[PDB]
């Protein structure tokens, strides 16, 4: 059976030689935002409606968690400046409970500070995160904290990768874990080469498009994917958008469009490699057309 049928589980059915790069991830946009419920704010400042344990449960593997520092010891999840009402730990957690459960998966978690600290603040976002979470005892062996650059599936299955869109960090492991860290391009498709040269990071992040040009933005890197057999080239495809446009038309309703849209082409490209594929609304079905997040799973090529 298709391997987006066991979504709990489905990378455990991969060879573990693969390198992450190589592997077509479902992640999710602004993954801490189910949280929200007043709903002007969810037009344009919530991108999903699944908890972080049911997106797992549904096969996502990368998480997009943007912060805010809320006191030297804290990191809240945030979209902007809106308060998606936990703190990083909460994720964490989830995580690892998740990761026990099914200790065959990695997740991959991205890192960003969204919004300025609160004003006791006196560390620095990236000091904070290093300290109190990556370095805190709590989330001993949680963590992927190996030395290569292009970890396999083997030596990260169990653990949390980090990838790292805070800047330049002391932190050793994980995507553009250096003092340099990730040069991310504003509403962009871009490429840059990261952890000291090892991988070249290809992105589409363009996400002030309007519809056409952002469908047309994620089917052209979704093109390169797929002509590129190279696991030292990673590609990260957005494809959630911003609120606003017609009326003034909510997260939701792009999602609405472009994850069918995309869906049905990459189900047309059969195995072609995909690259890792960030959604709104992960999870979240329509009858009649084709899951997004399935058909990011099952693109996947089972060769041994």
């Known amino acids: 059976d298709s391997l987006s049928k066991s979504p709990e589980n489905w990378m455990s059915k991969l060879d573990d030689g693969k ?3 190589e592997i077509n991830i479902p992640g999710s946009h602004d993954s801490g935002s189910f949280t929200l419920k007043d709903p002007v704010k969810s037009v344009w400042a919530k991108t999903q409606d699944k908890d972080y344990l049911t997106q797992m449960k549904s096969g996502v593997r990368f998480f997009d968690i943007r912060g805010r520092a809320s006191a030297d010891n804290m990191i809240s999840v945030h979209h902007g400046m809106v308060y998606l009402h936990h703190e990083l730990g909460k994720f964490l957690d989830d995580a690892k409970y998740y990761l026990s459960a099914y200790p065959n998966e990695t997740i991959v978690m991205s890192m960003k500070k969204d919004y300025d600290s609160d004003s006791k603040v006196t560390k620095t976002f ?102 590129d057999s190279n696991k030292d080239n990673v590609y990260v495809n957005f494809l959630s958008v911003a609120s606003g446009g017609s009326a003034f038309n909510s997260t939701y309703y792009y999602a609405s469009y472009i994850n069918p849209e995309i ?24 009858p009649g057309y084709d899951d997004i997040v399935s058909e990011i799973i099952d693109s996947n090529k089972l060769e041994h």
């Open 263 to 286: 869906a049905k082409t990459i189900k047309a490209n059969g195995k072609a490699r995909t690259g890792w594929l960030i959604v709104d609304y992960a999870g979240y079905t329509w």
């Open 19 to 21: 390198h992450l790069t």
């Open 126 to 227: 990236e000091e904070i995160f290093r300290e109190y979470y990556y370095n805190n005892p709590q989330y001993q062996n949680l963590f992927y904290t190996g030395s290569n650059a292009n970890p396999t599936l083997k030596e990260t299955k169990g653990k949390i990768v980090l990838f790292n869109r805070m800047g330049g960090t002391y932190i050793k492991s994980g995507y553009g874990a250096d003092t340099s860290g990730i040069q991310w391009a504003d509403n962009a498709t871009f490429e840059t080469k990261i952890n000291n040269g090892s991988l070249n990071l290809k992105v589409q992040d363009e996400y002030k498009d309007y519809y056409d040009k952002k469908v047309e933005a994620v089917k052209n890197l979704l093109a390169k994917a797929k002509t």
